[PDB]
């Protein structure tokens, strides 16, 4: 059948893009600039980008600009979204095209007559912002939005836009009986076909880059595997069972026990062996996936497959060096 995929030439975007051609989908895959080669080419170079892949130009800030590529769709991925944690204008740069591009599209499915499910990709971001971090988060967590802007942690304008947005496009699906379904990753970490840095790469490679400003992102920190994430995105289309949120995290574990495997299976780089203000007391958070596991959905891999992945192929696209 035929989908729309926003964002197509991301990390998320560009994988499933991948695993849905291999599944036998006909994708229309959406970028902002088709001619940028760096964005493009990685996804042109996919078996059945010939005959089953086109590119259509979008952008989630003017207004209708996915209504070509959504018409005819039978399903859609919204993956596309503003990823800059340092905007000087966050209210017009990322969180009002956050939230008004997510109803552009609902409104553009709507249009279209065609497609049979919406799936967003939210954020863990619209779950455990808060001041207080429970043990276990499931899909009736939503974040504090007046914390998160009080506090203004490292991504707090990305984590309000994915919030308001995920709230804004249920309230716009319950109104207008659209099936809708949100897939709430929390970092997603592995192997990627990009030929950039990935966004949540820059997280989650941290310990090894010493980029300290995400270390709070990864303090009580919960991850998944790119794939696994790629895999459930086509599970909850195709399943006809799926309604509401789906939390998609496999493992949990805190600054220190990430830095550990870390420094066990890369040797080479400068990994510290101690953090300021996390002890080996504090408090590991989970991302409970019970809720997806239950339809009968299967992770696949572990931490140390997503964390060689993410670093081998750095490696081998020369975005980490070999060694400190
Ligand atoms: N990776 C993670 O750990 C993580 C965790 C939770 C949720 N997510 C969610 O997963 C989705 C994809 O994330 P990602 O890691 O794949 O990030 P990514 O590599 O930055 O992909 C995002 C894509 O959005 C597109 N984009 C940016 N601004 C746009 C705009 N104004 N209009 C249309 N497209 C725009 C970009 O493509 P072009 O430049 O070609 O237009 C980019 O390739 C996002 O919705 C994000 O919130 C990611
Ligand atoms: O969207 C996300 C994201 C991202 O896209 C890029 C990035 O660099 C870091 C990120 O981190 C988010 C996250 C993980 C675990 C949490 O407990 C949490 O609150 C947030 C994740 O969901």
Not at 261 to 269: D, G
């Amino acid at each position: 059948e035929t989908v729309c995929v926003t964002g197509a030439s991301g990390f998320i975007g560009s994988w499933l893009v991948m695993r849905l051609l291999e599944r036998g989908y006909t994708v229309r895959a959406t970028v902002r600039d088709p001619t940028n080669v760096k964005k493009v080419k990685h996804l042109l170079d996919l078996p059945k980008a010939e005959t089953h892949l086109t590119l259509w130009k979008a952008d989630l800030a003017d207004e209708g600009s996915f209504d070509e590529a959504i018409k005819g769709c039978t399903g859609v991925f919204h993956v596309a979204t503003p990823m800059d944690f340092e905007s000087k204008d966050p209210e017009n740069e990322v969180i009002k095209p956050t939230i008004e591009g997510m109803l552009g599209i609902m409104k553009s499915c709507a249009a279209a007559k065609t497609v049979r499910r919406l799936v967003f990709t939210s954020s863990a971001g619209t779950v455990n912002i808060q001041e207080h971090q429970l043990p276990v988060y499931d899909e009736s967590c939503w974040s504090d939005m007046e914390f998160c802007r009080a506090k203004k942690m490292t991504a707090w304008m990305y984590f309000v836009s994915k919030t308001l947005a995920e709230q804004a496009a249920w309230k716009y699906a319950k109104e207008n009986n659209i099936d809708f379904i949100t897939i709430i990753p929390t970092l997603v970490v592995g192997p990627f076909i990009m030929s950039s840095m990935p966004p949540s790469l820059i997280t989650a490679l941290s310990p090894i880059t010493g980029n300290e400003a995400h270390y709070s992102i990864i303090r009580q920190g919960q991850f998944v595997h790119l794939d696994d994430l790629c895999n459930a995105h086509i599970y909850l289309f195709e399943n006809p069972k799926a309604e509401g949120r789906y939390i998609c995290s496999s493992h949990d574990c805190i600054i220190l026990d990430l830095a550990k495997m870390l420094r066990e299976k890369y040797p080479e780089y400068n990994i510290p062996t101690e953090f300021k203000g996390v002890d080996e007391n504090l408090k590991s958070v989970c991302f409970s996936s019970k809720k997806l596991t239950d339809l009968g959905f299967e992770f696949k891999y572990s931490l140390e497959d997503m964390f060689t992945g993410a670093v081998d192929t750095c490696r081998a696209k020369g975005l980490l060096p070999p060694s400190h």
